[PDB]
Design a protein around this ligand. Structure first.
Ligand SMILES: [Mg+2]
Length: 712
């Protein structure tokens, strides 16, 4: 499945400067001279030295023949050595007598002649070289003449790309070998010892051409070096989406990055996805594709293929791109299949999976990903990035396919998969949803669900299983008398009795909480004198609303900000590395919902902070500072909060939680005012969050800061 992409080979060669092409031929010659030298007794370095810049003179005969020349054994001699730089097996032949020319008949010689010229050899052979008298040049002029001969040969023929790739098949690996012999590195623009290069890892000549656009192509590395020898960059979202490098397949594979053997599943899933695309003829063997492995919030990874936009320009080389969210493996589809067969992507995919493993954000960051890749190989460079040539001839790295919209697309597909649950959904009133009703949240009230919290169908995308989840009030399994809230799944035992169990691990509760991020439960109490505490599922929520049920309606309705939970989380996120500071972030957020206000790592704020509307305030005095002012500043993440903004997923959910909570209590951020009694708590909190406690803030300063943000 494939053959050689001749234009990809030919493009690499054609886009070299003339100087770099001469150098390529020069290194090929050097390789063949080394072979001649070692295989002969005297060990003369004349040709070697007269070529490698000694001022002794060495005669060469040139021919109307590509890749070929003669090294006479003496001035004007008809005997010596015939060189064919493109011959698999006879790169040099000793010509001791005329008849030696007659015995040369292989296609690797015949190919070096144009269609027009090929007839000269008659049963084809080089016997006719005996009647011709070639011109003599000094050897220092040879690589130039060979370059000009190849250009002419290509111009004499109609099939430019194929003739070019054929005529270079065996020249290129010899050139690469010649370059690896260059002591202490190849020169860059007249400066010696600049460019390290080894021949190790090269496959057969044909396989190197087959793999020219593959991620670790050795020949692409050699071409890149030749470009660097003669002279000699990171993207933003607008530039990327303006470049439009990648076209979605429209199909994706969502997998878990956690659990033992997750990495094996990801590798197999990704190789599987590539194999299916080739069979279904969505993708051709030689098409350049980006296999994206992108982390997804909740410790998941999506594999998704993209085909390169033909609008982009020429693809120069495949490679590995590292995004903040994952890696892309770029090469021809056939290169990716072969690479999977060989295990070439295993260190990369192991590294990525280990850091996506239990990521709340699906955003381990470029540095963590890069480090995890280099872990499976002491401390090497980062893998070479794929590159393309734009319309004006500039070679640039290809942007990642893991753009903003890419993830929007991923989210759409997932949500279409989630559209068949809950036979008939319950038809609840706004008052029931606000938790204002004595009858409960709309579920059926029972002993272990006294609040009547509504059951929810959790679709476990991994297990392919549906679970029914209710936020229930259960005994604190030790101390009698007190109860706590827990999300639990119901199931039938052997006898048809309904039993209940916890989420087995934080990851699953986290995913449930995201999937049902908009729903509220009463985690407080229910009855006439009692405090209902109404809280959204969103795992990034640091607020809730609450009230006391009256004989009719409610009273003391207010929004509460969870000061220390918020403080601790933000201080953690402020470091830029939450995991380093506190645990697994996913575990931290799930655990937050079970933790009381004064039981977080930070306990600095003496109480929770309260906002209420003017009309509902009762006898609470209000400030003119609004939840909206708070949200505006939080959303902007200024000054010491700046790094929180690196995790947009977390920050958007924090804000959206706040807005949903304001709305659900029948209010809005601009109609919710901070209690006078919360003043000091708020200024202390923001002072710390925004300035590390270096600046004393007041509410007016906080309101003005919000005002400044809306003005811009
Ligand atoms: Mg032509």
């Amino acid at each position: 499945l494939g053959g050689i992409n001749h234009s990809a080979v030919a493009n690499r060669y054609r886009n070299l400067t003339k100087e770099a092409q001469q150098n390529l031929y020069q290194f090929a010659i050097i390789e063949v001279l080394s072979q001649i030298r070692e295989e002969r007794p005297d060990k003369n370095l004349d040709a070697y030295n007269a070529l490698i810049g000694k001022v002794t003179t060495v005669d060469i005969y040139t021919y109307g023949a590509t890749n070929m020349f003669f090294m006479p054994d003496a001035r004007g001699s008809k005997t010596g050595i015939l060189v064919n730089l493109n011959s698999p097996d006879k790169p040099y032949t000793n010509i001791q007598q005329p008849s030696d020319f007659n015995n040369i008949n292989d296609e690797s010689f015949r190919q070096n002649f144009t269609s027009w010229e090929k007839r000269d050899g008659t049963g084809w052979n080089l016997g006719y070289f005996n009647q011709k008298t070639p011109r003599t040049i000094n050897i220092s002029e040879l690589s130039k003449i060979l370059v000009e001969r190849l250009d002419y040969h290509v111009s004499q023929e109609n099939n430019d790309d194929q003739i070019l790739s054929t005529l270079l098949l065996d020249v290129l690996p010899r050139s690469a070998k010649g370059a690896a012999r260059e002591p202490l590195g190849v020169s860059a623009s007249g400066i010696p010892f600049q460019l390290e290069f080894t021949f190790e890892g090269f496959t057969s000549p044909t396989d190197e051409l087959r793999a020219i656009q593959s991620p670790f192509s050795h020949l692409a590395k050699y071409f890149d070096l030749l470009v660097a020898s003669t002279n000699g960059v990171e993207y933003s979202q607008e530039q990327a989406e303006n470049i439009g490098a990648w076209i979605d397949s429209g199909t994706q594979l969502l997998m878990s990055a956690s659990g033992i053997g997750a990495a094996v599943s990801v590798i197999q899933g990704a190789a599987g996805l590539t194999a299916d695309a080739i069979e279904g003829k969505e993708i051709d063997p030689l098409d350049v594709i980006s296999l994206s492995l992108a982390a997804i919030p909740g410790g998941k990874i999506v594999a998704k293929l993209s085909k390169v936009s033909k609008n982009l320009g020429q693809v120069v080389r495949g490679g590995i791109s590292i995004a903040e969210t994952g890696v892309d493996i770029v090469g021809s589809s056939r290169d990716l299949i072969e690479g999977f067969k060989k295990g070439n992507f295993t260190d990369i995919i192991n590294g990525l999976v280990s850091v996506a493993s239990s990521s709340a954000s699906g955003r381990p960051g470029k540095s963590k990903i890069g480090n995890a890749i280099k872990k499976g190989n002491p401390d090497a460079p980062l893998p070479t990035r794929p590159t393309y040539r734009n319309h004006e001839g500039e070679v640039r790295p290809i942007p990642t396919a893991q753009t903003k919209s890419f993830f929007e697309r991923v989210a759409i597909v997932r949500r279409e998969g989630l559209s068949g649950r809950g036979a008939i959904g319950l038809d609840l009133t706004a008052a029931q949803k606000r938790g204002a009703e004595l009858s409960g949240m709309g579920g059926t009230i029972s002993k272990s669900n006294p609040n009547g919290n509504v059951s929810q169908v959790y679709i476990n995308e991994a297990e392919g299983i549906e679970k029914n989840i209710t936020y229930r009030k259960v005994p604190v399994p030790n101390e009698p008398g007190n109860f706590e809230n827990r999300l639990q799944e119901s199931f039938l035992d052997n006898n048809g009795q309904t039993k209940w169990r916890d989420f087995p691990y934080a990851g699953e509760e986290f995913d449930f909480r995201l999937q049902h991020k908009d729903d509220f439960n009463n985690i407080g109490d229910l009855g006439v004198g009692k405090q209902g505490i109404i809280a959204v599922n969103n795992p990034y929520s640091f607020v809730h609303h609450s009230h006391t049920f009256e004989q009719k309606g409610i009273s003391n309705n207010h929004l509460t900000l969870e000061s220390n939970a918020f403080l601790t989380y933000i201080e953690g996120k402020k470091t830029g590395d939450f995991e380093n500071k506190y645990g697994n972030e996913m575990e931290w957020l799930v655990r937050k919902f079970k933790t009381k206000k004064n039981d977080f790592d930070l306990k600095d704020i003496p109480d929770n902070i309260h906002f209420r509307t003017d009309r509902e305030k009762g006898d609470h005095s209000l400030t003119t500072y609004t939840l909206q002012d708070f949200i505006t500043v939080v959303e902007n993440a200024p000054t010491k909060m700046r790094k929180v903004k690196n995790d947009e997923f977390a920050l958007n959910n924090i804000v959206e939680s706040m807005r949903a909570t304001a709305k659900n209590m029948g209010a809005s951020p601009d109609t919710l005012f901070l209690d006078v009694a919360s003043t000091n708590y708020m200024t202390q909190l923001m002072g710390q969050v925004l300035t590390n406690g270096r600046q004393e803030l007041n509410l007016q300063g906080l309101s003005n800061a919000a005002q400044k943000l809306r003005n811009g």
